[PDB]
Amino acid sequence: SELLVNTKSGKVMGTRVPVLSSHISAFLGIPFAEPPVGNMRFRRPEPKKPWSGVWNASTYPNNCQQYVDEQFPGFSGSEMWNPNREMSEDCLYLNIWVPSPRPKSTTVMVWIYGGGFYSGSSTLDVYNGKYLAYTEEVVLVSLSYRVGAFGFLALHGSQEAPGNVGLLDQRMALQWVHDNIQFFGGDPKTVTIFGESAGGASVGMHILSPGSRDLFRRAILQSGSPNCPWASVSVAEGRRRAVELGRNLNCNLNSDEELIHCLREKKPQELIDVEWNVLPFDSIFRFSFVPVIDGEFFPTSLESMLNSGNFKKTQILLGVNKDEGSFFLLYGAPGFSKDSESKISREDFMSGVKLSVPHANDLGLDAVTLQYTDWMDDNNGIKNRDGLDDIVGDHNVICPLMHFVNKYTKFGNGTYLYFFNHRASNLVWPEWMGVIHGYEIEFVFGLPLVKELNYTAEEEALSRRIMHYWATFAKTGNPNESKWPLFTTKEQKFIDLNTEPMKVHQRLRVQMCVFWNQFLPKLLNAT
Amino acid sequence: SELLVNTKSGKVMGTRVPVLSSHISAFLGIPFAEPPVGNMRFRRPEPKKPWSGVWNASTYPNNCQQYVDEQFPGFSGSEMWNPNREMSEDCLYLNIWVPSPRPKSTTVMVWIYGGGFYSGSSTLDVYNGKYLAYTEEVVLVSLSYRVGAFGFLALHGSQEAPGNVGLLDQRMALQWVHDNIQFFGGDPKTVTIFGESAGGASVGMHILSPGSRDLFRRAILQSGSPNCPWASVSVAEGRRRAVELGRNLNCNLNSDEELIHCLREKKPQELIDVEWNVLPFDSIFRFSFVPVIDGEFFPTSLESMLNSGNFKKTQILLGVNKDEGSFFLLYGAPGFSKDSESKISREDFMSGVKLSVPHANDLGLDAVTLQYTDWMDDNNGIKNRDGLDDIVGDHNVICPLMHFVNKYTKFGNGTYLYFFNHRASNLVWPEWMGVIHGYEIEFVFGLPLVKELNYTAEEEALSRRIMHYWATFAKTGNPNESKWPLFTTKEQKFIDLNTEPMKVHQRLRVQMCVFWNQFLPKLLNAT
Numbered sequence A, B: 001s002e003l004l005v006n007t008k009s010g011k012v013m014g015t016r017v018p019v020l021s022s023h024i025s026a027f028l029g030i031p032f033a034e035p036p037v038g039n040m041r042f043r044r045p046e047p048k049k050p051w052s053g054v055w056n057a058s059t060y061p062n063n064c065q066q067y068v069d070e071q072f073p074g075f076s077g078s079e080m081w082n083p084n085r086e087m088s089e090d091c092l093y094l095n096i097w098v099p100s101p102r103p104k105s106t107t108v109m110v111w112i113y114g115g116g117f118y119s120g121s122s123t124l125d126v127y128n129g130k131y132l133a134y135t136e137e138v139v140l141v142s143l144s145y146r147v148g149a150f151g152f153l154a155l156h157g158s159q160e161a162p163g164n165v166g167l168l169d170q171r172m173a174l175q176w177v178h179d180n181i182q183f184f185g186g187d188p189k190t191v192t193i194f195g196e197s198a199g200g201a202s203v204g205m206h207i208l209s210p211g212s213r214d215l216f217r218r219a220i221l222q223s224g225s226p227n228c229p230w231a232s233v234s235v236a237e238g239r240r241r242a243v244e245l246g247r248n249l250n251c252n253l254n255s256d257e258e259l260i261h262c263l264r265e266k267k268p269q270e271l272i273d274v275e276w277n278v279l280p281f282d283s284i285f286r287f288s289f290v291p292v293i294d295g296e297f298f299p300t301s302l303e304s305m306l307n308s309g310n311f312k313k314t315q316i317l318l319g320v321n322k323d324e325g326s327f328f329l330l331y332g333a334p335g336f337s338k339d340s341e342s343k344i345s346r347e348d349f350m351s352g353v354k355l356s357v358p359h360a361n362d363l364g365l366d367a368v369t370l371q372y373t374d375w376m377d378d379n380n381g382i383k384n385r386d387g388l389d390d391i392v393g394d395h396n397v398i399c400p401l402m403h404f405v406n407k408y409t410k411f412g413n414g415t416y417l418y419f420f421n422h423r424a425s426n427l428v429w430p431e432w433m434g435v436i437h438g439y440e441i442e443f444v445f446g447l448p449l450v451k452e453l454n455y456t457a458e459e460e461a462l463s464r465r466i467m468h469y470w471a472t473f474a475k476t477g478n479p480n481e482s483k484w485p486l487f488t489t490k491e492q493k494f495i496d497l498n499t500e501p502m503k504v505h506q507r508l509r510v511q512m513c514v515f516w517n518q519f520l521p522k523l524l525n526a527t
């Protein structure tokens, strides 16, 4: 039977799932590690003990314990990102969509969900690999990793809570794909890892971590790069936030051992209830428990690794959305509200930039303000709104990503850069938010093909084109079967991804990224 | 006789001069002080001892000793600015153009020549007051002042060379106009002082100096404001450059007395030969001997005087030319040459900005570069050229002027701001130089009315309009008899001055002046 698969971990029984006018196989909820519960909480993952009998892989698994967005109760714009299955510490599982008839050796695509390292679920509707698997004849794998304190609490030096274990969770699943995907028709030598936002940063981190580079071949990074200001913290900072977390739960802070012991006694929600109280600054687009630059997973600073070529050389496909900052302003900047146009006052703007660049001194804030302010119309509410959107997007996603691609492309084997600037027609988020962070995803996963979701015809076409670009790139290292140009350090070409005839541009937001990548950093160091 | 005038200094005999199809009276070369020669060199001017008999005022006087521009031998673009009469330390004289029949009590206009405080002559052809006097029925006065070391050498504390004596020379002539212009048909209570570049700065300085404010009523500032980075130095700097000058002439530097004594023995050209060797930096748009903030002429810092309203409140008419920097780049920046298009390399640009902002640290230079560089086309030679033009103009003329008008307009009685962006049709300077510093002058003085100079018809009209605007403003404090709007701190309106139908704009080069007036200064102070 096509739904019975034998693996090195045990036999697995999938389920047949309807897709468009056909069907495909799905192996949902395969364990790839031992449940990280009890005294395993905060520990590196353990390979899953082989099992006996058939593992029922017909239904989605639990989602990892995470902060649930309740900012807009019942609103689909935000609930669609929330856990849609019971939450549990026992959440290290993977899901596989396999073409029918089962392929012999086809391209494997491994999806790594984003969500600021504090949230994320592999079971979301927008992450349903069946349309992609089915349409592009790829084996689609979606993994899960521990988020929040559970996956990123870091007490560097201790082995009970070393930090980065959520990154190790990904590694482990990658390890399991490497070792068992051939039994599902997939070629373990043509495994493309792809993710968005924290998923995209995760991808880039796997590219940099020596212990991960051999587990996959190609990488796709969506609105995320490993050097994003929010993707990692120092081990000192990781430690400070861990103590602070303990402080918030009235933990003995006399030793790591006492601290960790206290944190393992706490119920999951207790850690989640106080998770946001350990940020060091009042800010937006900053998450509490993220990857730490520990000297293990990451041998040295990401920047020295990027400068010295210390990373896996391969082909990479990456890009950004036009309005990456909008979502974060909405949830944490004053003056923004879902149901208004969010025209922003100069007073609100100034406080907005302060939240956006939390580490800057006043001079830094002044440099940002000068750079993003139209001084010929500094009271324009639309312009202040939009300028703020760009500030948040440019600094947190686009410029860090642009720095990454420029460092990467010096040593890599092929860089393909996109700019997704298409606003879905059926978007429920206010128009001012633009082409929102995370909204390329439904296009990558082919949601626009299911008519009942009401996308336009042109949007179906764009999805098909993006899916084909992504699958083709995973298969051969080149998106192309007009042409999506190679990104080179000299020409810096990139393409637009929208319902209009693709256009080729150069130097994505140069002016601003020179400001964020070269000038601001120099400013803050000088002062 | 209409050419014989009796004054409190003695009788003066003018000459009848043809003007267009008529004539007017001219009193050329009236002494307004004792010749500042011999041991008077560097000293404050002395009122001219009354004379007996008729003073022959039929021919232009000598020009003050000054650096002669020999950079383009025989080229009129630059020779027209050079002394056109014997040069002499005996150069404190004034010239008066009076309508015929001699008026009874008309508006007086006193022209103060610019030239970086190192050069300048009242006798230039472009400064011929006959067309203005004649056309607008104003009494036109042109004065002279000591330039270079002779008028601005400053050994603060010494009385032999106190500094600012070239400013006192202007004051003295203003004093003489005050006291004797009624005998020429002029109203000493409706004296408008106007000047360009260093002349414009001089005007603004007279507005600030307590000892000068009562000598005139209204002021016109052309491409110059008292707070320009090159218009004054500290007394310490004034002292350092004086010693350095002495050092260059092998003067005893043991005391001011010895130093000054040595400098008075030197022949004029000896001081001029080494004048540029005392600048402290490699730079453009910086002159050696300029006004010093001494505590006398200028009670406190210009900025505290500007902030506290410590200045004469009246009506002011001021403005800038579109390409104020072009002239200086041509003479001191690498890559610029008269006969080429001066496309500028990124290497030359970078060295250009360094010459332009001599006091900035590398971070400052980076801030300037970031601000004026099109990073989407950073190798464009035209763009680098033009960007440099703007850098020099914005920093030395336009933004200091904009800061002045904004401080002034808080306390003054009427600010009128123009932007002269008309390139004369018969200009001999290369096209890339644009609307060059100093080229509004021929329009203000009505040269375009003399057909043999070959201006266009539209240029005749523009001259007439500018002359009428200037004369009308001097007469009533308002340029208007469409309308040249009042400049207000809230609306910041200004007008264009060109052969096209005047247009009203707002906030002249805001973006850049916030950079020069607020951000850069904050940057350099922080660092």
Ligand SMILES: CC[N+](C)(C)c1cccc(O)c1
Residues within 6 Å of the ligand: A081, A114, A115, A116, A119, A197, A198, A327, A437, A438, A439
């Ligand atoms: C846009 C929503 N999504 C779940 C993808 C999300 C949430 C938090 C941070 C992110 O960067 C992205």
Ligand SMILES: CC[N+](C)(C)c1cccc(O)c1
Residues within 6 Å of the ligand: B081, B114, B115, B116, B119, B197, B198, B327, B437, B438, B439
């Ligand atoms: C443009 C020529 N002109 C004599 C007016 C001149 C010379 C030196 C410095 C100036 O600002 C202006």
